[PDB]
Design a protein around this ligand. Sequence first.
Ligand SMILES: *C(=O)[C@@H](O)[C@H](N)CCCCCCC
Ligand SMILES: *C(=O)[C@@H](O)[C@H](N)CCCCCCC
Ligand SMILES: *C(=O)[C@@H](O)[C@H](N)CCCCCCC
Ligand SMILES: [Cl-]
Ligand SMILES: [Cl-]
Ligand SMILES: [Cl-]
Ligand SMILES: [Zn+2]
Ligand SMILES: [Zn+2]
Ligand SMILES: [Zn+2]
Ligand SMILES: [Zn+2]
Ligand SMILES: [Zn+2]
Ligand SMILES: [Zn+2]
Lengths: 485, 322, 485, 4, 4, 4
Amino acid sequence: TKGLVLGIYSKEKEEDEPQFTSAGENFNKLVSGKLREILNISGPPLKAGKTRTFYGLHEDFPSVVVVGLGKKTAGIDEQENWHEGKENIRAAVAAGCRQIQDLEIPSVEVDPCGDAQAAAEGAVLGLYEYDDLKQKRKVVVSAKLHGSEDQEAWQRGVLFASGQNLARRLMETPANEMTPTKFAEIVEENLKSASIKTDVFIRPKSWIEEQEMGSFLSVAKGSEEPPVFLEIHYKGSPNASEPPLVFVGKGITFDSGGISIKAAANMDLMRADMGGAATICSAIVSAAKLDLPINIVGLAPLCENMPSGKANKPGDVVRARNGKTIQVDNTDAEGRLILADALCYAHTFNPKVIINAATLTGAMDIALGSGATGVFTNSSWLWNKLFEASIETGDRVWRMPLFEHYTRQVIDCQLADVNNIGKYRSAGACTAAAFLKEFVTHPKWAHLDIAGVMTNKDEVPYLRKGMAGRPTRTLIEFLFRFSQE
Amino acid sequence: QNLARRLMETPANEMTPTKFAEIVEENLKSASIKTDVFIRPKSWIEEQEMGSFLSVAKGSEEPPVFLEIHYKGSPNASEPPLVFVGKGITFDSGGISIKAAANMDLMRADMGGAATICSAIVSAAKLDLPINIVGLAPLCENMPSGKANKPGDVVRARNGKTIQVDNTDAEGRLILADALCYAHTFNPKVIINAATLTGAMDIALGSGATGVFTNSSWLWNKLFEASIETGDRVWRMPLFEHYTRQVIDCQLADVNNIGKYRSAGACTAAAFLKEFVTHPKWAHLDIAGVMTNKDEVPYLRKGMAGRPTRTLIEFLFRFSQE
Amino acid sequence: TKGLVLGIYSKEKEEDEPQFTSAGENFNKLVSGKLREILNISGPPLKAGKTRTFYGLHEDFPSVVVVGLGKKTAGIDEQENWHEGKENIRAAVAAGCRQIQDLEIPSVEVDPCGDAQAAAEGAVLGLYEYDDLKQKRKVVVSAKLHGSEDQEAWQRGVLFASGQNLARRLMETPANEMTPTKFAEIVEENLKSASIKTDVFIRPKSWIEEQEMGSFLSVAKGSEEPPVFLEIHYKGSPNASEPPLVFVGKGITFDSGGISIKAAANMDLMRADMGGAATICSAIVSAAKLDLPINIVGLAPLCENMPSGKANKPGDVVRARNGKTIQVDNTDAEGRLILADALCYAHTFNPKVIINAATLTGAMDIALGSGATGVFTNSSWLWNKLFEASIETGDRVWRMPLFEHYTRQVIDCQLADVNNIGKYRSAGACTAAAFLKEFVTHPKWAHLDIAGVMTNKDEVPYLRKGMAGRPTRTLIEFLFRFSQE
Amino acid sequence: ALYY
Amino acid sequence: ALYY
Amino acid sequence: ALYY
Ligand SMILES: *C(=O)[C@@H](O)[C@H](N)CCCCCCC
Ligand SMILES: *C(=O)[C@@H](O)[C@H](N)CCCCCCC
Ligand SMILES: *C(=O)[C@@H](O)[C@H](N)CCCCCCC
Ligand SMILES: [Cl-]
Ligand SMILES: [Cl-]
Ligand SMILES: [Cl-]
Ligand SMILES: [Zn+2]
Ligand SMILES: [Zn+2]
Ligand SMILES: [Zn+2]
Ligand SMILES: [Zn+2]
Ligand SMILES: [Zn+2]
Ligand SMILES: [Zn+2]
């Protein structure tokens, strides 16, 4: 009655035939060699990420999908900066699970493939689709570990993937549903389900005004949708006074550009302009689910960016919480405006680290596309921790420069202390990062521009087309390692 | 036809949804006492769950109305009516998917669908045609603001289908979805809608002929024969599942309001409308290309053309004689 | 050792289970019911165009792909203007053959599925890829009829599909290989292989000049690539003096736009701007292969459209063969320039019909996309013959208007008798057709604007992505019926 | 609707 | 020909 | 932010 996904490796030069995983070889034994026999008859060997489906092998598993895992011993690939074996497993298991789903089978058991966490990630990421609003849906598939030996690692993969899928849900949902208020309520319920050691404050416009967040308010005011400032606390440290790590996420729930209005083409993707808030909030939910013994604060200014008779006008000058004035030359450079105020507020926590994420610039997509999230940081220690985490998760990061060269192009400003768009078109992600740095005094800060990793087409084999929720798992892995130190 | 031309040419700050409804009301009532007119307000539109139509109207501060007109010409009061539906966008800025400045003033005539079907019904009443007719015209503006439709938003049509609004300037199919659904509640004999719907229609046939998409060759041939007499020509365009597949391929919802590709824009717009139609004799007239005259029709001065009003009247007249 | 493709229909309300074709039911008998048994185990029924692969059922057929054929009795669908049954068969068989190819199996036998011609079309169209220039290729698959009863219909499908694939090859090949000279040489060799009742003249620039084809010459001169005027005769009538049908095709081997230069984006597709010549020439080759008892002449002006120091300049006035002057306001409206001279020449044959094809306007793609070829004709008899042929082939046509309304917009001309681009943007395919009509006096002429059907993505399920070679089969079917009358 |  |  |  269930489907079964089993792995096979590529044949090594010294082997007579490609080797099954332990689970594949055991299943083959159970069916008196019929799996190997039919795989032989079926023709060419299964290469990494490829699948083949065999029917009627066992009364309990009418459909068995064998998936190619590539080289058994594939480890860290220094030319790709990731663990290749884990990436092979995520892709192959995703492909196998999609095939089971296409056969309309509601239950699947999955070979741990020598790394149950990566297997669970492939299945759970691989099956995910946002289809709440559609009458016609694929069968809902319940994936479970095949066997009972690798359970903690399997559940850890489920938890990591579910954190990323939460971010994908939050990003994909249409903006008329995923308003600042709705986003805050959904993160609140998820965080509270994860741990009772949690406080959530959905701070209203009146509080934003009391906090003198003039830069954030200037963005929100064009729209009739109320802004909120989401503040989430996870109190995981055994010492309540232990300084927290602080995450900050850009939560623009829809970006029209405002008065500096965007072109029509593909503007619908701007419902995911709260991806920064989605990924940092989701990572914190997952950290709470993991019980990590650390204090964490999440901060997400949430609003829409819309044109109207009260919107930001090019040339307007606004005052950030820290008292710096900003000339708003381009109203579509709104993420740095809202982040200025959130980053300022971040310092009030005495944090150990400040990490922000934002779908910030088109220039980042032109720079590195969906190959890797761009990381700008004043701490090589912090860069290296994020980079090492990314190797394990496969959700890659790539360092980008914080140089005074770019700063000079944003503090060169006709009316104010800093200009919100550079003097030139060049290096847009770098001048955006330099603008943020004018609101940071902390010695361990990282800015992640995730505009290029906002969506997947087919680049990441285990994510279906749509909002990607990257790099949620790299953030979770970073927090997990930090908590062990 | 001149009534339709007046309604189309008048500036949109005068020809609001309310004003249009009041002018059609007075004309229909002058034509026949066998007439009911309901200028249905926003509260009624909400009660009727017309979420797709409401999503267009909300960007503007101008109140929407749903105009419903009845002409009771049949000797049998229970005889099923013919139902006409017209797109009544009183001004189309494009909304958040905003149009370029050049010649945007012509978008005051984006209620030409409503103008031509309403005018044809007024004329049918003036002719005493012995048939029951219902006219339906969702009327609103399409404007950008802090409450307007946002690309990617998902709205629920009256029939419960969800629509992903990827382009807010494809607003005519949004309002027609809800009006077409409502059209079925009358048990009609035929459903004919008209709309200044796509730029693609103007690129396809210009002002040579109105494009007609219909699931009934009987209905095509009746409109075509009427057009020969009036000279206000029609030309058939295809309803194929080929185009349907490009609008039901949709990331978030049951149907997407703009195709996956630039090609065949009038055809994918027609396929979107067809997802809101179960009736076996329906015709969609995309009149975007015949919205204006320069000199092509020698007997119309430059300006809004009110086409194909006379072809609709001739169709009704012949239908009533059978 | 071979693969096998078998059909199954959708279950009718009165049937207990979905029915195999004759060949499927016979194969099931041969394998003692194992096909039906495994199909049952495999889960949900196969719907139209869907496939499922079963391994090890028979020693001679290690891979058997069952394909869903839809409703057995699907005939002409008056809402789609085609024979639905034939379209279902072409799609399903293409899908089955692709699955066999993916398994790297070089030989496949194909269920005739109750219509061997449609089956052969699905297999032969479905497998085709232009890969001559690539090191890495798919396995070459040889498809043959399963069984020996439907051979003529099977070979007729192979012939029709091969004619279309010839056009696809000619269209897809890069323009630096597919020059006017190369195109003419390839059509020559194909026509001569088809029948000895054939003459081919690859007419050089000197002949084009002698024929006073000033409009065609004005296009060709911008490029250093020599123009040719291809003239092909197929003498199939038993009476040598029987007037021919004449086909004319636009053979722009690459369209840069000339001085009215095109934008960069996707300009590579303009290698297929000789699709008009490709489809009419290919249809004539296939007519010869079919031995049709009719006289046919094919005419294809071939050249490039390039910018240079000798190219057409906007505003230039050129003299067509018929003595009419043309104001070349837009050098990218070059197809109507070359067709003016070819259409004039067409009349010298005393033809029974003149049919031209051209990838003529972007407006045609905006009008109907790839749903159907636009047909402009002064003869409803001729329209109806092309329309009826299209129902059978599934390669649909759709009539577009020839009205003096559009003529008036091209003869309104500052310098000359006719202007080569309209006074307005509206109805571009219609004003292009009206321009052509100024070069036609014949009472049975049809102009096919195939710009929208030049390529396939996924719209036609049995054509892989790339140049489509449409509507070659509709032209062949038209000629075949005309020859029977 | 525009194209596109 | 393009439009326009 | 766009470029530019
Ligand atoms: C799509 O944009 C529709 O909402 C517009 N009303 C189409 C207008 C097309 C006008 C073309 C003729 C001038
Ligand atoms: C006018 O520019 C013609 O000369 C071009 N060959 C038309 C090409 C239109 C292509 C549209 C489909 C991709
Ligand atoms: C600047 O315009 C930012 O406010 C936008 N959110 C950037 C969006 C860049 C998207 C690129 C990937 C599709
Ligand atoms: Cl920004
Ligand atoms: Cl629309
Ligand atoms: Cl042309
Ligand atoms: Zn922006
Ligand atoms: Zn943004
Ligand atoms: Zn519009
Ligand atoms: Zn409109
Ligand atoms: Zn051209
Ligand atoms: Zn061309």
